[PDB]
Design a protein around this nucleic acid. Sequence first.
DNA 1: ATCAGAATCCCGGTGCCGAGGCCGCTCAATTGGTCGTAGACAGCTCTAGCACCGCTTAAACGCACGTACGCGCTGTCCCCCGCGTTTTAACCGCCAAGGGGATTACTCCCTAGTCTCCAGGCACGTGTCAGATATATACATCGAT
DNA 2: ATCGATGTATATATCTGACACGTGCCTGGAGACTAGGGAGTAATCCCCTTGGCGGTTAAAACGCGGGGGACAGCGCGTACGTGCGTTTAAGCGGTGCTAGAGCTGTCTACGACCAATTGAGCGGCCTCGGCACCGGGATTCTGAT
Lengths: 95, 93, 96, 97, 76, 445, 78, 83, 89, 90, 82, 103, 105
Amino acid sequence: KTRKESYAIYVYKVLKQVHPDTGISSKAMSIMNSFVNDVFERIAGEASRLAHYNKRSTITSREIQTAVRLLLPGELAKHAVSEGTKAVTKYTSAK
Amino acid sequence: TRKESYAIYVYKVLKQVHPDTGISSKAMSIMNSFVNDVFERIAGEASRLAHYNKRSTITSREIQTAVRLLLPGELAKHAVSEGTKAVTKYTSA
Amino acid sequence: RYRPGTVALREIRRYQKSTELLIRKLPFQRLVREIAQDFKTDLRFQSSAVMALQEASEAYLVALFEDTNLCAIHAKRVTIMPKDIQLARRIRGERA
Amino acid sequence: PHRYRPGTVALREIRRYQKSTELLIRKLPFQRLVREIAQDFKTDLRFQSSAVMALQEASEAYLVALFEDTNLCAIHAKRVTIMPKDIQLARRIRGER
Amino acid sequence: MQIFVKTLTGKTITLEVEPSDTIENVKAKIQDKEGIPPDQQRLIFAGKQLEDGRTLSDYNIQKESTLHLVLRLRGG
Amino acid sequence: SICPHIQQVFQNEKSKDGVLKTCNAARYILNHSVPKEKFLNTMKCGTCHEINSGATFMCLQCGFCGCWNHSHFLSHSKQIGHIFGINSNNGLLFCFKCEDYIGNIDLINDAILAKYWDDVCTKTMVPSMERRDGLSGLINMGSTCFMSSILQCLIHNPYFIRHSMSQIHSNNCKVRSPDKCFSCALDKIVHELYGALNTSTNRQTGFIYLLTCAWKINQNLAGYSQQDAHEFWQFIINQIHQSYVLDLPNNNKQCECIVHTVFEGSLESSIVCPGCQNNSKTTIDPFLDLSLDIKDKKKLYECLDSFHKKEQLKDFNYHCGECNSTQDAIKQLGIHKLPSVLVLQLKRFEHLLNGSNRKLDDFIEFPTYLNMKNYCSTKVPDIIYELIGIVSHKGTVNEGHYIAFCKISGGQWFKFNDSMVSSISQEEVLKEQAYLLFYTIRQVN
Amino acid sequence: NIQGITKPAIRRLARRGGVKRISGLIYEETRGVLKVFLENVIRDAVTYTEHAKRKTVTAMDVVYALKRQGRTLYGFGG
Amino acid sequence: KVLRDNIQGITKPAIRRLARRGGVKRISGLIYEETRGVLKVFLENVIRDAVTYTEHAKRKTVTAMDVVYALKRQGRTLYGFGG
Amino acid sequence: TAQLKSQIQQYLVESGNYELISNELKARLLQEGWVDKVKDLTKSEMNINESTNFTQILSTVEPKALEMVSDSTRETVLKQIREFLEEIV
Amino acid sequence: ITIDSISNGILNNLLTTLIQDIVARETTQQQLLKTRYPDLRSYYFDPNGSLDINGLQKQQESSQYIHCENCGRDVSANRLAAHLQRCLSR
Amino acid sequence: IKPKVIEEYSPSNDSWKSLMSSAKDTPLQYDHMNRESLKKYFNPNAQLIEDPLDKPIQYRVCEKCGKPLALTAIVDHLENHC
Amino acid sequence: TRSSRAGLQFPVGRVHRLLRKGNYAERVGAGAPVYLAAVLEYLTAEILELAGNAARDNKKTRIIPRHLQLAVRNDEELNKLLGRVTIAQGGVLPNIQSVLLPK
Amino acid sequence: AKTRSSRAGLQFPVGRVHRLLRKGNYAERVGAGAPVYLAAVLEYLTAEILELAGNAARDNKKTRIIPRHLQLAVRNDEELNKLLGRVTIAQGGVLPNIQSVLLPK
DNA sequence: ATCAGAATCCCGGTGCCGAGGCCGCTCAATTGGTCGTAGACAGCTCTAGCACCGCTTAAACGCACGTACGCGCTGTCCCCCGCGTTTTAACCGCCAAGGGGATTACTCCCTAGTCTCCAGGCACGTGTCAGATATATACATCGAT
DNA sequence: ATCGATGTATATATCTGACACGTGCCTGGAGACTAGGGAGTAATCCCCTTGGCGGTTAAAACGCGGGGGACAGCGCGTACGTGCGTTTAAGCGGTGCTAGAGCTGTCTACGACCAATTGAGCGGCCTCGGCACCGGGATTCTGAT
Ligand SMILES: [Zn+2]
Ligand SMILES: [Zn+2]
Ligand SMILES: [Zn+2]
Ligand SMILES: [Zn+2]
Ligand SMILES: [Zn+2]
Ligand SMILES: [Zn+2]
Ligand SMILES: [Zn+2]
Ligand SMILES: [Zn+2]
C-alpha cells in the first residue's frame, strides 16, 4: 500500500473550529485540497520568481508577504498579512 | 560590467539567410526578448513534465514533447525534425 | 393552454436551480472515443476523465450561451443568432 | 468655396494613422498624469523615461484594442456611431471589471 | 506665535505656528527638521492625543505651549 | 474561638447598642482630630502622662487613658474592670482577659451600619474564597495582548475599585446600557470578577462587551491588529471623561470625573533669559502622564533629572524687555501640582538617519519607592511614592508582546499574562524591561 | 457519431444560460464549437498519455490539459 | 509638490486620433469620460504593481524591468525593452 | 522627678517639633524597605507559632525588630533631636 | 542626669508605637481570613513558572469556544476578533 | 529648666468625650499626611486614601443582583436599585 | 512540535519539506513556512465560514459543492481571485435579465 | 571541432544554454541531448522569423529592418500570430484593415 | 376584477449507505550538534532626473454652418413553442474475462564534480553611407455641374 | 457623363548620426578522470478496465397550428462633421548638481547535513442518522371571462 498524503484532518479541524455542528462531504474536501494546493504552488512560484529577479537564493518572510500582497486583492491581502504577522509574532515570542 | 546576449548569433543567422539586410538595435532587443521568453516557456514546460513524471533529470524526450505541446502542428513537426537531425549529428560525432 | 414564454421561464428556473448534467453519459463517451480514435488507437479511458470532460464542456457551453444571450439582448433582439455566437467568440479572443 | 462631404476626411485620417506608427499621445501630459497617479501610492518617487515610454505604448495598444472591439460591437449593432454601452458590453465580454 | 515641541532625545524645538493652523501644518514643520513620517508621529498634549482635522485653538492650546512627540510600539 | 467576654455583653441589647454607639463616635473623633491635641488627649497616659509609651488605649466607659509599657491601662481593668480598650493608633478593640484583639467579628468592623445590621445579614453576603481578589485572566481573542494588560492594572486600582463599587455611574447614568457606554461595560467586568453573574467559558462575558463598544467608536483599536498600549491608555481614560459630562444634569476648566480628580496634574515652564534673571512669564499646562527618554541612562532618577535639566533655546526668536537684547534664553520645566497617581512612560525607541527606528533594550533601574522632593518648582518636605504597577513589552518597534506586572494588598506581586495568572517574587519584577510605571501617593511629610 | 448531442440537450443548455428563444443553426454552431474544443483537449490528453509511456488516459492527464489551457477545474484530485 | 487636474491632459483630439487608428468612423460625445476612466483604472493597476516591485527591491527609482514584470504578470508582455 | 519628662514632651508638641520627628522616622524606614522586612517577620511568626495571640506575637517581634534598625538610621535621628532638646536646656 | 539617656527613651517610645501599629493590623487581617474561610488555602507558587495560581498549565488555543450573543454562534476564541468585524457591521 | 515654657505656653480629670464638639467641625484628618502640603502641592479635589494596600478590598455581595457594593452604598442599593 | 509554538493547525514540517523539494530556490528561510501556513489557514477558514453560512441558509448540516459555488460567486474578492477556475457540480447563479420578464 | 556547437553544426552556444539550464533551478540533473535540441529549435524559429522580416523589408525597398517590419511579419502569418497573440511589440503599429460597411458606395 | 385549472412547496413517514470515530500501525519531524558561506553592513564613486530658463510654433479650443441617420412608428409576413402521439435505447443490475498498471529487486553507466588551460565574446574605439529632410513635379481622386 | 482643385505619390541634392568593423583581454567554456546514485530492465500480482445480456421507461422524434416576434419601409430633427480665427500650451537647446544607483572590502550569524527516536499521521472497520425517496395536501401562479 502507498502512504499518500492529504489535508482532510486539518480542514476538518478548521471547520469544527469555525462551525462545530456542520459536516462536509468528500467532494468538498477534494475541492478544498485542490484549491489549497493551487494557492500553495502559486505563492511558491511567485516567491521563486521574486528571488530570481532579485538574484537572491534565500526565501524569507518579506518575499512571501510581497507575493501575497501582489496576488490577492487589497483587503484580502491586508488581512492575510496581518494574520501572517500575528503568526510570526507568536512564533518568535517562544522558541 | 559584462552582459551576455544573443546579438552575434542572430546577426550570423540573418547573414546566412539575408546576406544583404541590416538590423536595428530595437529589433535586436526585440529578438533577444523573444528568444528569452521562448527559452523560459520551454524550460518551465520541461520542469512541469519532469515533476509530473517524478523524474530528477531532463532528457531530449522532455524537450521534444514540450516543443510538441507548445508549437502548432506544422511548426512543431519541423522543429522536432530539426532537433532530431541535430541530435543525430551531435551523437555521430 | 399556456401562452408562449411562460414554460420557457419555468424551464429556465428549473435548470438554474438544478446542478446535475443535462447530457447523457453514453453518447458523450462514444463521441469522445470516436474523436480520440484519430490520434491513437487502442486507448483506455477512466470514468473520472469522461466526467471531467463533460463538466468542462458543459461549463464552456453555458458561458458561451450566456455571452450569446447578452449579445442578442444588446442587439435589441430576443432570439439568438449564429452571428451573435461569432461576435462573442471574436471578442473573447478565442476565434482567430 | 469648396467643401468636402462628411466621411471622406475620416477615412483619410484612418488610413494615415494606420500607415504611420508614431505615438498619438504626447509625452508631457501623460507623464504628469502618471506621476499624479503614482503620488497616491508613495511619495518622493523617481521614474526613468524608458518606463514612461513603455507604459504609454502599452496604454495606447490597450486603447486601440478596446476601440477595435467597440467598433466591432457597433457594426454588429447595425449602427455606425459608437456609444458607451458598446464599450460596456466589450468590457463585459472581455471579463474586465 | 511660537511653541515648543519635545523631541525623542529630550531636546526641545521651536516652531512658528498660528492659532488658525491645523495639526496638519505642524506635522509638516516637524518633518522638514527631522524627516519623521507623520503617520508614526503621536502628538500628546494634556494627556490627549491630537486628532486630524482640528485646529489648535479648539484644544485650548495657547502661546508658548509644550508638546510631546512620541512613537508607537505595536504588540500582540 | 470567639471572645466570651464580648459575647456576654452581646446578650443584652442596650448594652450592645451602647458599646457600638461609642466606637462609631470614637472613630469619628480620631478621623477629625488636630494632631496637636491628638497626643495630649488620645495618646497621653493618665498615670505617668508619657506620650506614646506603647499602645495607648482609651477607656470604653470613661475618659481614662493608660500606657502599655507600664500596664497603666491594664491596671484599670485589674482595679475597676474595663478590659475593652480602643487603640488610638488604629481604632481596634483589645480584650485584656483574652490578651488579644477582636478581629473575627464583622459587627464591630461594620459598626457604622449597626442601625441596619439586621438587614445586611439577610440581603447581603461575604465574598467567596476564590473571588476575594478577582484574579482571573482574559482570553486573548487575537492581537489583544495590549488590551488585557491595560485593564489588569485598573482592576486592582484602589481608586477605581472605590469608584466602581460605590455605584456612582450606575445611579447617575442616563442610558444604562452596557453595549453603549464604556463605564457601563467596565461595571460589568468588575461585577464578573469581584461578584458573580446570576446565576471554561466563565468570567469572560464582560470582556466581550468591551470589544463591541470599542468597535463602535474606533474599529482600529478593536484588537484585530497589533496596536500601541500607551495609545490605548489615553483613549479609554478620555472616554470616561466624555461619559461623565454626558451624565451631568446641566463652564469650569477642571472636571470632577474620576480621571480629572486623580490623574490630572499641572506642569510649569520657565524661559530664563541670561540678561537680568528676572524671567519669566509662567505658563501652567495640565497633564495626565509623563514621557521620559532613557538614552545613555541607567537609573530612574537619571531620566527624571534630564527632564528637569535646563536647556538653551537655539532656534527661538526672542526680544527681552529686562535687558532689551536678543538673547538665547534657558528653558526649564517644573512641577506645579502633583497628582495622586503618577504614571511614567519610557521612550524605548530611537530615530535613525535612514528613517528607521530601533528599540532601546537597555535596562533602566527603578526603586520601589520614589522620592519627588528634588523636582518641585516652589524648602520642600519629603514626598514619597510607591510602585504598584509595571507594564513590560518584549519585541521590536512594530512587533512584540505585552506582559503586565501588578501588586495587590499584602506586598504580593503577580505575573499578569493573557491567560496565565501566577505569583512572582518582588526582586524578579525589578529586573524586567519596564515600559510603563505606576506610582501612587503614600506619605507626605 | 456527432449527432449524439440532440436538440433537447442543446435546448436545456441554452435554458440554463438564460436563452428564451433559439434559432435553427445554433445547434450546428454549438456542435462545431464542442467538436473543436473536444479535439483540442483530447489531443492534449493523448500527448500527455503518450509521454507518460502508458495506454490508459487518467484523470490527472485531463486536469493537466485543462490547467494548460487556463481552465483549471477543481474536484478531480488536481 | 502635489499634482492636480492632470487627468484632463488627454484632450479630445488625442482620443479622436486613437479612435481613428482603430478604424472608428463616427464618434459620440460621451466616449471621452469612459475612455478616461478605463485608462485611469489601468494606470492605477500597473502603477500599484510597479510600486510594489520597486518597494520590494528596497530602491527609490522605478526602472523599466519592474514595468516589464508588471506587464508580464497581467498577461500584457511587451517587447522592446529587454528582459 | 516624674514631671520632668512630661514637660519636655509637652513643649515638643507645642513647638511643633514632635510631628516632624515622627515624619522623618517613617521616611527613612520606608525608603529602605524596613516596613516590608518587619511585615515578612510577622507573617512567618504565625506559621511557626500557629497562633493569633497578640501578646504572644508581640513578645517576639518587638525585641527582634530593635537590632534590625541600622545604625545609619539611628545616628541621624539622635543627632537631630539633640539639636531640638538643647533649644530649652 | 545626662542628655543621651532621655533621648533613648524618647526614641524607644516612638519605636514601640510604630512596631505595635504594624503587628496589630496584621493579626486582625489573618484572624478574619481563617474565621470566614476555615478551608482557605494559599495560591500555588511555581518556582519554574509553568503553572498558574491553581497549579494548571495554559490551555491550548483555540481549544475553547465562546458563545456569541449577537448571532448565537459558538465562535472560537482566536476567531472572535474576525467574527465581530462582520456580525456587528450588518 | 527655663520658665519660658511655663509663662506663655502653659492624674487629670479630663475625658476623651470632651472633644466631641471639636470633632464635629474639623475636616478629615490623616495620620502621616500634612494638610499644609495638600493645598501647597496637590489639587484640592484630589481623592486621597492613606495606605490603600494595607488591607484587602472590604465589600459585600448582594443576594439578588450579586453586585460588589461598598460598605457606604449597601442601604442605597437595596431600596431603589436592587 | 512547531505548529503548537505558533498556535496554528496546518503542519509546518510538511510545508517546509515541500518548499525544500520544490526546487524554487537554493535555501529556504525559517519564517516563510509559518507565514505561508498562516495565510493558507486564514484562506481556508474564510472559505469554510462562507460555506457554513451558505449551508445554514439552506437548512443543511453537510456542505455540498453547490454551497461552495454559491459562496464563491456571491463574494467579490473571491470571484475576482477565482475567475478562471471552474467547480464540478457547482451550477450557475439564479440570474434572470429584466428584458426577458413579461409585463 | 573543439566547441560543441561546431560538432552539432549549429550557431547558438550549447555551453551557454547548458549553463543556463544548470543554473536556472529547473531540475536537479541535466541531460546531454536537451541543449542541442533546444538550440536547434531556437535556431529554426529565429531563421523563420528572420526570413519573414527580410521579406517584409524587401517589400518596402529598405536595407535595414524596423520594428514595423517585424510587426507586419508576425501579424501576417497565422502560426506566429497564434503563438504571439498576447505579445505586444513596441513601435509596431496596427494592420491596414478597414471594414467594408464603412466604405462609401 | 373574477375564478377554474394546473404547478409547485411543505409535511409526514420510511428506508439506506457514506462518514466520523476508532484501532492498529510506522516513518518523517524533532532535538542536540557541527561546519560552512550568502548576506548584512559600511564605504566610496559616479551619473542622469529634475527644476530652469528662453525661444519658437503646431496643435488645442471655440464658434458657424450644414446634413444624414438612430430612433420611433407603422405594418406585414412566418417559424419556433406548446401539446399530443409514437418510438427507442439508456440505464440498471448482473456476470465473465483479461491485460495493463502498480510494485520490488537487480545492475550499470553517465554525469556532477574537480583540476587545468585557452580563445569567443565583451566593451571600447572609429570610420561611413541609408535614410530623413526639403523642394519641386506629376497625378489619382472627389464634389458639383 | 465632364471640369476644377486638392492632398498624395515620386525624383532629386545632402548631412548626418546610428550602424558596421578592428582590437585587446578575461573568464567561462573545453579536456581528462573518478564516485556513486538515479534509472532501465526482469519478474509478479490483481484490480481496474472492457465486453455481453435482460428489461422498461423517461426521453427523443414527428406533426399540428398559431400568434407573437423578426423584419421592411417612411418621418424627422437633432447631434456630429467640416472649416476658420485665436492662442496657448507643447517642444528643442543647453544650464547645475546632487541624491540615489552601483561597485567593493569585510565579518557572521543563520542555514544545510547528520544520528535517534518516537508519536503524529495514514490504512482499515463499523454503526448510524443525516440525507434520499415517496405519498399526500395545501399553496401559488396563470389564462380566459
Ligand atoms: Zn472605665
Ligand atoms: Zn502611661
Ligand atoms: Zn477576655
Ligand atoms: Zn453609562
Ligand atoms: Zn474630566
Ligand atoms: Zn534681561
Ligand atoms: Zn453575533
Ligand atoms: Zn441588590
